[PDB]
């Protein structure tokens, strides 16, 4: 999503 969303692997 936005810059603050989950940036890690899912």
């Amino acid at each position, epitope marked *: 999503a936005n810059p603050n*969303a989950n*940036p890690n*692997a899912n």
Partner: antibody
Amino acid sequence: QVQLVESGGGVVQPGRSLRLSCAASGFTFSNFGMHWIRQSPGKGLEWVAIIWYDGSNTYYADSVKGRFTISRDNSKNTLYLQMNSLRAEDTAVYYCAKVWFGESEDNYSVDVWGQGTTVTVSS
Amino acid sequence: DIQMTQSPSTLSTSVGDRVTITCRASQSISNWLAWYQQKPGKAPKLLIYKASTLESGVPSRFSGSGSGTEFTLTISSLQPDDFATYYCQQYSSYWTFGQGTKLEIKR
């Protein structure tokens, strides 16, 4: 545990370039997004850039947009910050930091910071 | 751009005191607020995220409270390791830090 070791800082003349690197260990580097954050006596703590775990998305602070490039090498477990067109006000201690693990709908920030590497932009 | 404000900038305090420092945001950031501790010459360290959740390893004398625009960090009984500078950080829209609050050794 988690450990982050920055390197590449030094004295650089205004207008020149510099490449910072951050060696990561103690966790699966390729699974996590990373930040660069800087600290100076004049501006305090100042977020610089973020990169997704796979390098797909990057975001930058307005003060460095167009001049800095964040990147990563997941085979080498290394985060990079290519700094171009450096100005005096970029003088700071530069930290890499690891994004924490959370739930799918959370907002995210950092849980582990590196030791920092000093950048001095001066003629 | 969300502005953050920390008060006070310096608090003179003593071992065993109950300490409360405040952080405020220019607009609503819900509970997306983190607290970082920094000792001189040392890297910052995460204390609290989601306004009130203690990071693992953080002693129980730390707590946080707040939602929306007003936030506080409380140390129920101050110990010598807590003499440091404390920063808040909103992470609702990008990332911006407060100016920091220094807990100073009263004498």
